Write an enzyme that holds these catalytic residues in place. Structure first.
Site, mmCIF file in Angstrom:
data_model
loop_
_atom_site.group_PDB
_atom_site.id
_atom_site.type_symbol
_atom_site.label_atom_id
_atom_site.label_comp_id
_atom_site.label_asym_id
_atom_site.label_seq_id
_atom_site.Cartn_x
_atom_site.Cartn_y
_atom_site.Cartn_z
ATOM 1 N N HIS A 41 0.759 -1.378 -0.028
ATOM 2 C CA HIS A 41 0.382 0.152 0.309
ATOM 3 C C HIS A 41 0.518 0.642 -0.002
ATOM 4 C CE1 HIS A 41 0.228 0.152 4.756
ATOM 5 N NE2 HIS A 41 -0.071 0.372 4.724
ATOM 6 N N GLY A 143 2.799 6.048 10.241
ATOM 7 C CA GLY A 143 4.196 5.951 9.340
ATOM 8 C C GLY A 143 4.618 5.003 10.302
ATOM 9 N N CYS A 145 3.883 2.012 10.052
ATOM 10 C CA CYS A 145 3.636 0.630 8.602
ATOM 11 C C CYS A 145 5.215 0.031 8.625
ATOM 12 C CB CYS A 145 3.010 0.601 7.333
ATOM 13 S SG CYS A 145 1.194 1.499 8.100
#
Ligand SMILES: [Cl-]
Length: 301
Positions: A41, A143, A145
């Site tokens: 993503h 942030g 991820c």
């Protein structure tokens, strides 16, 4: 003596953390040999979050669309490919800090350490369990991820989780390092929610054994129960079924304390029916279910 939520030392994983940017999206990547692993993503824009076609989005990308930074050193991307919900960015440099590693998928009820990262920079380390409903109760901000979960055996880092998203209840969903989601979660915008969760019964028992090893024994009793009579009470309190295999895994803790598993089950049943009555076990007023038999042995031997 003592019992704490204890993480694995994070050094071996710290050396692998990198920043990955595509358009205005920055998140964390895992740099092992000449590959950087990150959530796919990263290629998404706000426009197409509802129903992205990642194959379409990836085919429209170039190596040069991917900014990879290990500290202040840019890494040149010489290849990209999708593996399930994970992106694989081939880079021109092998990570000289690559530890002995593997990609292992864990079971619900098993624990791991999370190195929470922002802009490729490690912020902190904490213990987590994979919940029966395939969520983790993590601590993650915007942030985070691409932050990974891991266990260390000897020199070997077993990577088991990469962080992808926060669900509406504030719990966390992610994949193994082969990019396959834990649970029924998808990396697209839907009404998806965590299903009903249960308590990890075998872990609660391992934790009662930790307490006894640490001189907490007020909850013990003379009674024993049958596996089936216990499981009938467990089910009522939204506890996972306890299996003979669970009884066998608790064997070494049984032996060390000379308390039979079905003996300790009678304590747990008592505690479920009457509560703690204002007492604590290992500094908790709740039954803790995020320590495995292994975690107890590791810390209590
Ligand atoms: Cl596991």
């Amino acid at each position: 003596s003592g019992f704490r939520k204890m993480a694995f030392p994070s050094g071996k994983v710290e050396g692998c953390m990198v920043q990955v940017t595509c358009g205005t999206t920055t998140l964390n990547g895992l740099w092992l040999d000449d590959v950087v692993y990150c959530p796919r993503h990263v290629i998404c824009t706000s426009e197409d979050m509802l129903n992205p076609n990642y194959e379409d989005l990836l085919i429209r990308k170039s190596n040069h669309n991917f900014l990879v930074q290990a500290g202040n050193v840019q890494l040149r991307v010489i290849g990209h490919s999708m593996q399930n919900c994970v992106l694989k960015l081939k880079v021109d440099t092998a990570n000289p800090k690559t530890p002995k590693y593997k990609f292992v998928r864990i079971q619900p009820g098993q624990t791991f350490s999370v190195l929470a990262c922002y802009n490729g920079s490690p912020s902190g380390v904490y213990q987590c369990a994979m919940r029966p409903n395939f969520t983790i109760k993590g601590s993650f901000l915007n942030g985070s991820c691409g932050s990974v979960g891991f266990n260390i055996d000897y020199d070997c880092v077993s990577f088991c989780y990469m962080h992808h998203m926060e669900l509406p209840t504030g719990v966390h969903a992610g994949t193994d390092l082969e990019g396959n989601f834990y649970g029924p979660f998808v990396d697209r915008q839907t009404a998806q929610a965590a299903g009903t969760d249960t308590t990890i019964t075998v872990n609660v028992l391992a934790w009662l054994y930790a307490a006894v090893i640490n001189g907490d024994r007020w909850f013990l009793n003379r009674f024993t129960t049958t596996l089936n009579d216990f499981n009938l009470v467990a089910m009522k309190y939204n506890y996972e079924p306890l299996t003979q295999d669970h009884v066998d895994i608790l064997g070494p803790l049984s032996a060390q304390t000379g308390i039979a598993v079905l003996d300790m089950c009678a304590s747990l049943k008592e505690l479920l029916q009457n509560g703690m009555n204002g007492r604590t076990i290992l500094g908790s007023a709740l039954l803790e279910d995020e320590f495995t038999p292994f975690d107890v042995v590791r810390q209590c031997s």
